[PDB]
Each structure stands twice: as C-alpha cells, then as structure tokens.
C-alpha cells in the first residue's frame, strides 16, 4: 500500500514523555522497512515478543500503538512481561502475554544537562500496581503513614512524582534511555 508509516514522528520526536505520563501514538495502514529501524546504530535493545520484527513491514491492514517515554538505563529491564520494580509496578506495565516489540537507546546526549535535567519524572508510590497499559497521571499527595495529608507534603505524606537526575556524568545505568514499545490493537 506504498504510503510510509510515520515512525519518525515517534522515534525522532525531540521531546519525549515522562514515563508516568507515557505517550501513546497510533500507526496504522501503512508500509515500512523494519531494517532501517532495526539496524539503527543508536539502539541497544530491539526485542520482539510473540512476533517477528519483519511483521513491521506490512501494516497495510493493521493498527499499531507506539508508546514512548524516558527512564534510567538500569530500568529498561523492567519494560518486559512479568517484571516488577517501580517502573513496572507504578509507571508503565506490559501484560504477561505481551506481543510486540521493545526498543531502547541511550539518550544522554539529548536528555542530560550540565546542571541536571529535572524535567523527566517517575511515580514513586501508589496504593496498588498498574494494570497492563494503564496510565496514572494523578498528582494526589500519597499518604504513607497514619495521618491524613490534607493536600500538602507532610512528615509521611509525599508528593508521588520524583524527578530523575540525569547529570551527563552519571554512570550508564543512571543515564536517560528513550524507550519505544510497539504493540497491536484490534
């Protein structure tokens, strides 16, 4: 069907979302060359579950969701079926039977700043784990103790979103990684 999938709007976007407010775009009814994308030198992870990456060529009759966001390098492992941790539990959860692809690349050149980039946030606390592909963008004070919070920080009442550091001198595990997750809709 000749019309090219606009994957550049996803991968080459200049802004990426915070992981708690992860971005979802629809790609559908288009053709691509998956190897232009797969062979990119920047990527360090390009993993496909229950699908071959060649299935990204022929999207002529298929709807794909592209989810994107920034996390720390040592958290990329959590963007996978069956994982636990702050990111899988409280920010972005894949289902146990995920079929799709997970792509990640070190973005220190883009997303770190000399004094520290504090723009990217993650959710540190939640009363229960996220369901698959659930988004929680609430900003209510998290009550960790027995005293009600009344809307402001307290001794054990915490604002639930925390900023990543992203200092360009961070170890690689602490550097920012951009992540794209590709999955199918019906």
């Amino acid at each position: 069907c000749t019309n090219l999938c606009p994957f550049g709007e996803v991968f080459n976007a200049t802004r990426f979302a915070s992981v708690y407010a992860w971005n979802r775009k629809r790609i559908s009814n288009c053709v691509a060359d998956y190897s232009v994308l797969y062979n990119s030198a920047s990527f360090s992870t390009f993993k496909c579950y229950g699908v071959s990456p060649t299935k990204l060529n022929d999207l002529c009759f298929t709807n794909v969701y592209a989810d994107s966001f920034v996390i720390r390098g040592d958290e990329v492992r959590q963007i996978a079926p069956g994982q636990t941790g702050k990111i899988a539990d409280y920010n972005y959860k894949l289902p146990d039977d995920f079929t799709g692809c997970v792509i990640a690349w070190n973005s220190n050149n883009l997303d770190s700043k000399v004094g520290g980039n504090y723009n990217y946030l993650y959710r540190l606390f939640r009363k229960s784990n996220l369901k698959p592909f659930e988004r929680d963008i609430s900003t209510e004070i998290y009550q960790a103790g027995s005293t009600p919070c009344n809307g402001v920080e307290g001794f054990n009442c915490y604002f639930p979103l925390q900023s990543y550091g992203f200092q360009p001198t961070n170890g690689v595990g602490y550097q920012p990684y951009r992540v794209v997750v590709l999955s199918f809709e019906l």
Partner: nanobody, 122 residues
Framework: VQLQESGGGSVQAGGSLRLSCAAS????????MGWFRQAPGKEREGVAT???????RYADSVKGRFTISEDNAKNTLYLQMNSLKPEDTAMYYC??????????????????WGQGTQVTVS
C-alpha cells in the same frame, strides 16, 4: 538451566581466541543469547548477541573482528575473537534469555549466566 564457558586464555596483539558456551537445561524454541565482558573495576558490557532466527548484533568496538554463532545440534554458543587488542582484556560471560527475538546489549535483560572465562591480550 546452566551455561558452561571454555576457551579463554592469553594472546598478544592481533591474535585470536574462540570462546564456547555449552547449554544444559536449555530447551527454548525462541530465544536470544549473548556474550558480555567486564574489565576489572568496570561494569559488564555487551559484545554480541544472536537470536533463534540467526539475527546477529555487535557492539561497535568489536564489529568486524568478532563473530558470534550458535550450534543448535550441540546446544553450544561460540564467539570467534580475531584481531585482539589490549582493550579486549576482560572476563567474558555467556548469557541467555527466553521468549523474545532480536537483540539487547543490556546484561540485565538476560536471566541465565555463565561462570565467565578470562581473556588477556598483552
């Protein structure tokens, strides 16, 4: 599951080794396998991966010098290391995971690990 390395040793500049990794409790239809290295006091880094479809991926520092291959009859993974440079000295580790194809140079995306063998290039 268990993974057994062998083949390490010591060479001089431009020399070659061939590492091998024999799998035991590994019966996975779709998988990705890889080689990782760790120099003293440094973090463990990926060098090469191969999936159950034969797709290979190499770190930039080794492309053109190292070749990863898999013997499915023998359930053994290989790393042919040519052109060795002093920079290549490290403990090298075989690793393996299950259920996805493609590549990842990230050690923590692999659930199964080998003992590691020593490669010295002087």
């Amino acid at each position: 599951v268990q993974l057994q390395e062998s083949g390490g040793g010591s060479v001089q500049a431009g020399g070659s080794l061939r590492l091998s990794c024999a799998a035991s409790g590994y019966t996975y239809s779709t998988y990705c396998m890889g080689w990782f290295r760790q120099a003293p006091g440094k973090e463990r880094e990926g060098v090469a991966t191969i999936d159950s479809d034969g797709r290979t991926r190499y770190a930039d520092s080794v492309k053109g010098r190292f070749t990863i291959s898999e013997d499915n009859a023998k359930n053994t993974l290989y790393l042919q290391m040519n052109s060795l440079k002093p920079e290549d000295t490290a403990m090298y580790y075989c690793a393996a995971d299950s259920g996805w194809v493609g590549y990842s140079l990230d050690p923590y995306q692999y659930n199964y690990w080998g003992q590691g063998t020593q490669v010295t290039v002087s």
